[PDB]
């Protein structure tokens, strides 16, 4: 702890989602039915502590590694060393997109070709918390997989894609839920377009490049909330006031943030109390 | 602002030429006298060079519209790519000496498609905004490099990831060992495919996003670094980082160092500062 809190001086649309390796394309708020979120990737406190399956690098985000025997995939850590089931949900980096089927692109060290692995996260065979998931036709061998595209969940039949959810890792001690804190504030999300047969937008709490910055800096959290300005890098104009909270999330008061340009920069202004009332965006 | 590097262990970081974890530190074979990678290029005062993006979400990716014969490239956010003096759109893969296999997906459509890329033919002209479709049907796609294989031409050549592709039919500059027994240092990643492929880059991607944000003034000819064990704080080896954005060491070598250490800035020094062999 040698330096006060800062955020990267980088425009948002140049940064990445922290739940999949996708560029950020917009700022968003959640639909009315979403009362909290509990993402397991993209979780980092303002003083740089990773939570959940969150890796510090995008090269580990929304990836799996393991050995298929034709019936199950026995998971490992992404570097191939053993995954030991524990109180938590899954190996570091494991995808955390609930409310959809996954289509994971599987490749191999020492073999040609790629294979699409179709993952329904709802059946009893999907237990990454215990180190295994159904092979669903993936032949025997060792693979690394990265999430490629998504589709509506296979069960319940006819349900819609809902990326505000996390999967059923168990048959679990999770990174904690994030709640709107009051004072008219709503949670702010960094959105990315996800391929697949709809207009899918994947929300996350922090760009991945913020996470690697915070994890390296480990700046002291010296107030209840960090007042930020979302700034136009050309003019320096303040486009909107936001608060970042220690657990690692941002809020604003909508007038909204979805209408803001995506090429701005979040800039730390001051530590403030949780009672600090924001000007509507 | 003082110069710093991230306080993060190397094996937790990513290659800057493909979205792959770093698995070792390496040096080049004797026949490699320089490198000219176009991704993973960032000066010590935080200026990106070449096709290098600041985020791994843009690394080794393509975007464009196939008409069944050619893919007309765009920037990765879909806005127009304008041919210019430089090599290709930001993020475009820079792995020479191999065929690429790119996983193509689409916004608003199901499925993925493997796109097989020989970078040697007359049709591979990303510098002019187009590459051969090689059977990819009409549509708009985003592609990410997935695996590689031996280059289709020259016939029988083997994979050589020290090379860059033939973008044309003005590049980030070449990087040279500076003298004094020093050799270039590379961050290596295992790349999927049928061979035992190791992809070198000059800088971890997370160093690039750090430098681009910090933009610490380059106040000397070289930055003396220590590669430090985070448990003991012991110096495992002396390295120098040079302003163009690369590291060197004097091998005794770096390939035997553990990969879970941290590079730490020690002092600005002259280019002539003599390193202790690793």
């Amino acid at each position, epitope marked *: 702890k040698t330096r006060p809190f800062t955020l990267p001086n980088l425009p948002l649309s140049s940064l990445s989602n922290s739940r999949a390796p996708l560029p950020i394309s917009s700022i968003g708020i959640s639909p009315d039915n979403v009362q909290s979120v509990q993402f397991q990737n993209g979780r980092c406190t303002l003083d740089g*502590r990773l939570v*959940g*399956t969150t890796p510090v690098s995008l090269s580990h985000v929304a990836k799996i590694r393991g050995t298929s025997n034709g019936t199950v995939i026995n998971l490992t850590e992404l570097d191939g060393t053993p995954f030991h089931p524990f109180e938590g949900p899954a190996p570091i980096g494991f995808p955390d997109l609930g409310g959809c089927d996954w289509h994971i692109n599987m490749t191999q060290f020492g073999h040609s070709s790629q294979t699409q692995y179709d993952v329904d996260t709802t059946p009893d065979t999907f237990v990454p918390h215990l180190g295994s998931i159904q092979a669903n036709g993936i032949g025997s061998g060792n693979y690394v997989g990265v999430l490629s595209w998504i589709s509506p969940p296979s069960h319940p039949s006819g349900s819609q894609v809902d990326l505000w959810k996390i999967p059923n890792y168990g048959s679990t001690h999770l990174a904690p839920s994030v709640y709107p804190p009051g004072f008219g504030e709503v949670l702010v999300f960094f959105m990315s377009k996800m391929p697949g047969p709809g207009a899918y937008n994947l929300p996350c709490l922090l760009p991945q490049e913020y996470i690697s910055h915070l994890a390296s800096e480990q700046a002291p959290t010296v107030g209840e909330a960090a007042l930020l300005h979302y700034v136009d890098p050309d003019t320096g104009r303040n486009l909107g006031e936001f608060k970042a909270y220690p657990d690692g999330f941002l809020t604003c008061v909508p007038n909204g943030p979805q209408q803001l340009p995506i090429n701005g920069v979040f800039v730390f202004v001051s530590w403030v109390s949780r009672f600090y009332q924001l000007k509507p965006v | 602002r003082p110069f710093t590097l991230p306080n993060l*262990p190397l094996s937790s970081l990513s290659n800057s030429r493909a979205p792959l974890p770093i698995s070792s530190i390496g040096i080049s074979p004797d026949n490699v006298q320089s490198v000219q990678f176009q991704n993973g290029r960032c000066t010590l005062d935080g200026r990106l060079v070449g096709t290098t993006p600041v985020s791994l979400s843009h690394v080794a990716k393509i975007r464009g519209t196939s008409n069944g014969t050619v893919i007309n490239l765009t920037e990765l956010d879909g806005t127009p790519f304008h041919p210019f003096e430089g090599p290709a759109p930001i993020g475009f893969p820079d792995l020479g000496g191999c065929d690429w296999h790119i996983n193509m997906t689409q916004f608003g459509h199901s499925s993925q498609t493997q796109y097989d890329v020989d970078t040697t033919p007359d049709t591979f002209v990303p510098h002019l905004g187009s590459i051969q479709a090689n059977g990819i049907g009409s549509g708009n796609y985003v592609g990410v490099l997935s695996w590689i294989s031996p280059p289709s031409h020259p016939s029988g050549s083997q994979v050589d990831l020290w090379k860059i592709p033939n973008y044309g039919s003005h590049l980030a500059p070449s990087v040279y060992p500076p003298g004094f027994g020093e050799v270039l240092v590379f961050f290596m990643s295992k790349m999927p495919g049928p061979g035992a492929y190791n992809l070198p880059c000059l800088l971890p991607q997370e160093y690039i996003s750090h430098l681009a944000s910090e933009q610490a003034p380059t106040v000397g000819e070289a930055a003396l670094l220590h590669y430090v064990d985070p*448990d003991t704080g012991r110096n495992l080896g002396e390295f120098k980082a040079y302003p163009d954005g690369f590291l060197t060491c004097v091998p005794n070598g770096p390939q035997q160092l553990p990969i879970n250490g941290v590079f730490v800035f020690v002092s600005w020094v002259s280019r002539f500062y003599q390193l202790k062999p690793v």
Partner: nanobody
Amino acid sequence: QVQLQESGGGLVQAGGSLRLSCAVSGRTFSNYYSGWFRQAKEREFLASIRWSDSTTNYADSVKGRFTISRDTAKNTVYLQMNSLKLEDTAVYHCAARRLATYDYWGQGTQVTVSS
């Protein structure tokens, strides 16, 4: 919250042995390094172990006498201290690092070596 709890310290005779344990709980991350430290002036690193593959790293001062190990079912890390010396008297702490920094610390346990 991540919690580390040491047990096993106390009085031990020179030339004898002591086994310390550190129970790790409340963890949401699947891999990390666990380390043992001691302090009598400045803190001294003794040993670390990587959770996934049990890779170890030892200080020269204790190599060959102390052994670090871990039980993945019990989520416990052990420091086996053999052929103890008077200079081994210190307060011993276990710690955990998710990346390069030990952010989580146990409460510490006194080890007193007598002759």
